[PDB]
Amino acid sequence: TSPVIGTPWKKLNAPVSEEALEGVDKYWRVANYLSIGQIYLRSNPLMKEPFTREDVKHRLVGHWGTTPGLNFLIGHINRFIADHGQNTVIIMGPGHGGPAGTSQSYLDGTYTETFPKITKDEAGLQKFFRQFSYPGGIPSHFAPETPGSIHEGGELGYALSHAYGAIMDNPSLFVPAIVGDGEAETGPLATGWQSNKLVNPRTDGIVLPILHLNGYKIANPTILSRISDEELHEFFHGMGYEPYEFVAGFDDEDHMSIHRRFAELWETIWDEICDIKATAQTDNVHRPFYPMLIFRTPKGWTCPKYIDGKKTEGSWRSHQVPLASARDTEAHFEVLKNWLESYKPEELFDANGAVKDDVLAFMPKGELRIGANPNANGGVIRNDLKLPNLEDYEVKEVAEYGHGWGQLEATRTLGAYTRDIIKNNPRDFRIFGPDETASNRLQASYEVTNKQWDAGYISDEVDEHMHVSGQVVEQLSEHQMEGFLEAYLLTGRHGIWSSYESFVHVIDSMLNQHAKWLEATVREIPWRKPIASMNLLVSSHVWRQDHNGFSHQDPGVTSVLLNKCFHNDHVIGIYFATDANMLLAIAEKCYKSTNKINAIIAGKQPAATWLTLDEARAELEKGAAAWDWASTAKNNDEAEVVLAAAGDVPTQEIMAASDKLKELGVKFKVVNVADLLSLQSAKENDEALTDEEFADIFTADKPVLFAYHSYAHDVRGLIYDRPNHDNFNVHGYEEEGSTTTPYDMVRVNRIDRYELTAEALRMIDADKYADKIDELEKFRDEAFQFAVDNGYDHPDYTDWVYSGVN
Amino acid sequence: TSPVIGTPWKKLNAPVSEEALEGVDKYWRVANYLSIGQIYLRSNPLMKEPFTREDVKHRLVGHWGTTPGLNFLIGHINRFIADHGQNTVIIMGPGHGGPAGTSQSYLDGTYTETFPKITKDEAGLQKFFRQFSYPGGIPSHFAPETPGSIHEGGELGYALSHAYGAIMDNPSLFVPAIVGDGEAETGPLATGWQSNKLVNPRTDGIVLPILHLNGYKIANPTILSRISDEELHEFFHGMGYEPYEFVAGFDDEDHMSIHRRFAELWETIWDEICDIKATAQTDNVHRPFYPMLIFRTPKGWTCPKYIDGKKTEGSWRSHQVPLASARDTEAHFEVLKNWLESYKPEELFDANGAVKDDVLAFMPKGELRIGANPNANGGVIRNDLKLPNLEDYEVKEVAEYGHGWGQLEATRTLGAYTRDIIKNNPRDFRIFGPDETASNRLQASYEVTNKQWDAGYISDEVDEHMHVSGQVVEQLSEHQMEGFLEAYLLTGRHGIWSSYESFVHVIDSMLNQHAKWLEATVREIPWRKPIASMNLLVSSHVWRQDHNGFSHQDPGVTSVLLNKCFHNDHVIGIYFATDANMLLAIAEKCYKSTNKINAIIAGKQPAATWLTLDEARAELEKGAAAWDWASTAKNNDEAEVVLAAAGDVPTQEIMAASDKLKELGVKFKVVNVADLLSLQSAKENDEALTDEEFADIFTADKPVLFAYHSYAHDVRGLIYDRPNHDNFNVHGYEEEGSTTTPYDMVRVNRIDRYELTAEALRMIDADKYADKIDELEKFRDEAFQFAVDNGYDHPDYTDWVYSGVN
Ligand SMILES: Cc1ncc(C[n+]2csc(CCOP(=O)(O)OP(=O)(O)O)c2C)c(N)n1
Ligand SMILES: Cc1ncc(C[n+]2csc(CCOP(=O)(O)OP(=O)(O)O)c2C)c(N)n1
Ligand SMILES: [Ca+2]
Ligand SMILES: [Ca+2]
Known about the structure:
The structure is cut from a larger assembly and holds two copies of chain A (806 residues).
Chain A: H1 18-40, H2 67-84, E1 91-92, H3 98-107, H4 110-114, H5 122-131, H6 159-167, E2 174-180, H7 187-192, E3 206-213, H8 223-226, H9 229-238, E4 241-247, H10 255-280, E5 290-296, E6 306-307, E7 310-311, H11 330-342, H12 357-360, H13 397-401, E8 405-409, H14 410-424, E9 429-433, E10 451-452, E11 466-467, E12 472-474, H15 478-490, E13 494-500, H16 508-524, E14 534-539, H17 557-562, E15 572-576, H18 580-592, E16 597-601, E17 606-609, H19 613-622, E18 624-626, E19 641-646, H20 648-663, E20 668-673, H21 691-697, E21 704-708, H22 712-718, E22 728-731, H23 742-748, H24 753-765, H25 770-790, H26 795-798
Parallel strand pairs in A: 1-2, 2-3, 3-5, 4-5, 9-12, 9-13, 10-11, 13-14, 14-16, 15-16, 19-20, 19-21, 21-22
Antiparallel strand pairs in A: 6-7, 8-17, 18-20
Helix pairs in contact in A: 1-2, 1-3, 1-5, 1-10, 2-3, 6-15, 14-18, 18-19, 20-24, 24-25
PDB class: lyase
Keywords: thiamine diphosphate, Bifidobacterium longum, lyase activity
Entry title: Cryo-EM structure of phosphoketolase from Bifidobacterium longum
């Protein structure tokens, strides 16, 4: 679970010391200098004679506009941390404020600790400035390469979901969450403000949202800075916050008055938070209004007010670089030089180029430093789950009655397994869902926990399984669920969320950003320890969406996740749960895995159970497997056709087609694919099937009929250099469907058992089986006409049991 | 459970009709006339010529002062009931307003229905007037003889506890609870206002408290009518009420404006109650402010303003009779005659003496009438409990190991039994306790229900087993617990409360009033059906009160309840639970009994189990029994002494004395008394032991040593004419004790095993056993000196097991 770090929720009981404020003001100057040096300078960091245009980088990359505001806030937060011993993680929402994050880590000493070549002297400072956003250096954003980041904030709008995920079951953790005022215009951010209705001030930590109201986004004003101050305050009060406003930099107030004013307001806010935390030790049934800070400052604060007659400080014109080419004109170089000198670096750095002791003597030390807090490197906190014994949940009836027995709902099995994970791993495992946990049949967890709800309660007739604390969280937002879980994992804990398949697409871009985090971490950031995997139960899938119908039918999550499978990163798992015993085997592998995004595509409809758990574990280790109990070919040369399937509904239709083929005497081989990346090119993926293993399973030369759960294009693209790939005939979802019966869903997508039987006969000999083929095609129209007439599927479809069942 | 009666919680959605108000005004006139006729007249009810002083009763009994106010309220409540079809029971707090209750029942027709000689004509009216508070007639109060009463209100202060008990698990029931403003000065009433924190507006009914603020009690003003109106309103608002005030009769407003004003205010109050009930169908988690009515009217309203120069209307002088002897003076007779004529009875009664149709055409009909509502005759609602099978709870180990086995806490057994009663009888069985349910070990009921709590919730760390509805109610008030339960029983349901023994005395006077209700019901009121018994678990008794010590040691409940055992009423049960199996047998008998007060004196300390359930049921049927398995005499003539005991600690000491006597060779007989009234004179009590049964058990002539749980005076008084009673030697509590060890409690009261052994030897031969007697007395001082030295009782005391244990 989360470590208790420091002395949390302590009031100061004194004014902020004038010396600490002189610390904060020097911090802001030197962090601003070091932010500018990283953007503009390739050499001569301390502007020794001669400082000329040759010291300027040839291409200016990075963002000034948000940066001096972030440096201000970070300076004051560091003072706060050292004075109070508070366990603190910052969410840097305007993540293009990269130079502030790297400057912080350089000043707190964690940068040189982590990156020993970047020393705390003039040659290390030169390397520090050159490397920023440079070929072979470090990124422009607050990337996972930076000590202290858990959030790159490249794609905007997840700051608050990540902040609130971080503090769940983390009652000593304080998260100051800096939100762009442009970022507050996004969808995901806008709903993220309501997360305070889903956290509990006793059992969870505290988020302080900080609205970086600098007035501007890239080229536009921001909505929230142009509405009235009364509207802006009512807005935050309507969302359960008590808003505090700070305004600075729009007049000629000296910088030391600003710092005193801010430290006074910070400590007032903090006294309000400590009151909330102290009250919650007794009463955590009544939701407080949490503080939030509206930080109103000019964009690009302390850049030159006018460059070439255009307003730059307090404008969108300061967003990227205020000064656009200091290398090309003497005039513009002089502006850069005077700007760099306005921070007076002669007082900040000593003769050797180290930042002076009195600049940083207010800073926190040890694990309380922003770049050294374990919650910001949450792999160091994370332990293996205590997992229950997987055979306790095995469907034993396959071994009793035969492969293909029963009408179980496979996700109920996962639900019972996850219930006992939650029971064995209190405060360490969570379930998230967008109001779909019961619907996706995971509600056995309510026997051991509750849905965390901190809005109002009204009646025990409606409010079953809800409590102000609990390990299940539901809000109708895929962005919230994915974002909560992502930060729960990045801070060292574990969990799962579930979703209807077609709505996974809502968070495709969040999955992309989590995968780029993971890809960069496993390629090049070894000091960042492995975090628990992002586990996604994909249920209510396309084949059993014949009640919501056509516009809820999109299995396309698989195509998205296949674009993050390169360079042997192995950050993606794509798993088709064939039945409940395969779902168990998959779930245990995903629950033991680290540094991944695991998609688990499982049906929740009643379906057969095909495998025992020991067979499921064997198929899962390779990824695909022949089912010799289902083949009537007895090796690869007497097979006429290979019937392969990936997914529970393709498996059902292929197994029903193999029974009709067997009745015709045909010699075939049956294959199941549980793990989709096992089919990936053996050159590209060293966990995938070797080409010899692939040709034993599939064959060297026989026609393979392949029923696939998602778009056939996924498979055709993956097997492009596999042996015998020209003989594959992939059937997937093909954008057909309506609100209809289950048979009609498989029929219109050409994956029903009769079409698959017919396709196998056309592949074997379309001419000797011509009579029987015309017979199967006529039944397809007749079983559809039965559904229209009677209101339910034809009994030859619905009553079918595999012949292996005794 | 409670019947749903009528159309509850319906708004009127129209003004009160002017015709109904003329009904109410005629009701008030005729009820006032009939109230005065009952007090003053023995003949000539309609004052036919000649109406003289001979028609006046020789002795004036009864109360005028509260009556015209009650008649006003009752008239308006009857109009309300007929207009809304509301299920309604009235609690008449000023129960000395008897004539209002009898007048109501006479006007609603239920009186003549119930009492066929009191007809609705002039001769029935004559009998109606003469019988009131007259030799061989009916009582002065709102007695159980009156249709519509569930509360005599003789002893004041239980109106609100009874009102709130009535509405528990009775969600269609409306209870207008009329509270005396003098009665509001009592202890029990003052805490009764807080009961609205213990009821739930969805699962329970609604009480409307009506403060009958007439300004005066017997001879004094009332506190609540002499404080400021701002204080009086703040007071009721502080207790969770929304107070409404009505003021009338202190000016010359005509009576029809008063009725319109009142009906408008009544319907506003009722619209507020219907809103509460409608809201509670959705949100019953948030406690509403319930309405209450402050009814401010002159005491004795419509009596002559001045009699003999003394203010009478609006004074305490109208409390009993305004006019003190209308039979002795022509002047005072004329005052009575003009008073009777002011109601203008010529318009109220027709030529035959029936009340005219237009007086009563507004009245409710059927079961909605006050005197016909089944909640006011709750024996008609009551069914037998579904009781679980008693052998499921039997301590089986007596039969395995021997009599005297174990260290069980007997009340835990009752707790498990009562849990499954509650489970089988939902909404029909309640437990009450004054914050003592867990302490008296009855907390197995929390496995199936909750403590009903409707004040604020703060935290799951403190608020375990609480819910806004549930079948256990706790408030630290014996008056509330006894009063809640009493009305739950009178409205047809069942239950139990428990108490520490010494605090039963707190409600001695409530037990007295319930017993007088029951005594009058079983003697003479056959139309009033049997109600479930008042069951009281008396635990933490005097012998195991050596931790609270001396001032918590009072077993005297038994002496109080022995004063209500006359004339074969059988309304009292006094039971000593010898062990857990006897407690089961007792509890089942009490749970099946009707029309009783059952005291069940049971220990909750670890103690031996003496009897099997089949033996316990045999002893319980007779009440006392010989224990032939424990005697060493083999009939009555070879016994030298009879060792009798009543109660678990006397049984333990007598069984330990019998083992030491056996070791000496003595021939004795052991008797246990489970039911105290079995010893009562066989002439007085036809359920008690016959004199021949008594002398078989006790003997004709042997010394009986009798260890009794409570004061020896109880037993000595009961056996005064029994055979061999001069040979009894009763040992009870004798007002000795301190905070001490359990042995020291029995030692200082001369009931410990060593003193009892010694007393038996003095009774047999004090001279041949003189050595061993001096030995036992010296050990008593030595086992006390051990406790002082070591801090716990001597091992010969604590480690003793009966020799019957294998
Ligand atoms: C989802 C998304 N769309 C577009 C962008 C491009 N972008 C980067 S910075 C930026 C402006 C950000 O504004 P604010 O949130 O206002 O940042 P700050 O001013 O503090 O620089 C935008 C639109 C983005 N990062 N994310
Ligand atoms: C416990 C108790 N003590 C004393 C009395 C005697 N008593 C009877 S009526 C009465 C006055 C009652 O006053 P209120 O409650 O003011 O009645 P109302 O005016 O309506 O007649 C008193 C003191 C009583 N009935 N109960
Ligand atoms: Ca901005
Ligand atoms: Ca009064």
